[PDB]
Ligand binder design. Structure first.
Ligand SMILES: N[C@@H](CC(=O)O)C(=O)O
Lengths: 165, 158
């Protein structure tokens, strides 16, 4: 049977705590790629404001395509996050992330649609920054909750901890 | 002696170091976003409505970049574990390059040099840091797995 290890006397504990870390990792990747999406969008939008004769304008479409690529990758990681069952103590903060993620994700997909035809006015009018900021704060909150829970688990024994259904 | 306690402290350290690098990376991307938002206002120009925010936006980039550097200093305050030294030094080299790049961009916009701003190969510098971070994360995760599963000899952490 066990010890499995000093930190995880049963190997089930390691499965749980490792889940927890994997969920953080996939949410960190989501956030990273949403911010990369914002960067590619803004680099595209600014070039759509240029004169055609500026050679720097020529990348506007490649950059919007790169936004589409990073936003797809973000959503891939987010699905991986959601595929991993939360622990009960993480359900509330996970729902909070979900709310803010949906808002900011939707926002970014709308900006892609605006730039697709060079509609820079619709792009500027969106209050994107506030949605980004809300996601970032939700992310921070999730990370603090996760870390505190992780420390509770590894210092417990225990070796119960059961995934929420 | 005290193997469990040492494993708890070292695992906590590796997590905290990854968290600080994550914060540094996110804030450097936020700096790059804020720079681009300032550039959008400069391209609207005069009193074209959101255009008067160019300075506030550029100050917001300076703020995120200083916050990045704060987290990076926190990262450096945690001594690397032996098998993490080289990947830590790789992060240092790529961080410094990208940090300098972003300071150059700030300076370009502060002096109205939009051309130099757009011509800098910023993406390559970001990507090089991102690859350094990926290498670091791989190395850290191998060590972490070994520590928390009692598969690490004492030299690696104790
Ligand atoms: N070179 C800067 C500005 C730009 O090209 O839009 C960047 O890549 O962030």
């Amino acid at each position: 049977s066990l010890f499995f290890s000093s930190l995880h006397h049963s190997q089930k504990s390691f499965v749980v705590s490792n889940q927890l870390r994997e969920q953080q990792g996939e949410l960190t990747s989501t956030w990273d790629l949403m911010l990369q999406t914002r960067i590619n969008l803004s680099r595209s939008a600014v070039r759509m404001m240029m004169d055609s004769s500026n050679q720097q304008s020529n990348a506007k479409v490649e950059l919007l395509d790169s936004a589409r690529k990073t936003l797809a990758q973000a959503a891939t990681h987010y699905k991986k996050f959601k595929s991993m069952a939360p622990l009960p103590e993480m359900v509330a903060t996970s729902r909070n992330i979900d709310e803010k993620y949906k808002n900011y994700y939707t926002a970014l997909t709308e900006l892609i649609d605006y730039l697709d035809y060079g509609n820079t006015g619709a792009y500027f009018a969106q209050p994107t920054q506030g949605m980004q900021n809300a996601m970032g704060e939700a992310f921070a909150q999730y990370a603090l909750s996760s870390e505190k829970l992780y420390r509770d688990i590894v210092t417990d024994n225990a070796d119960d901890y059961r995934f929420a259904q």
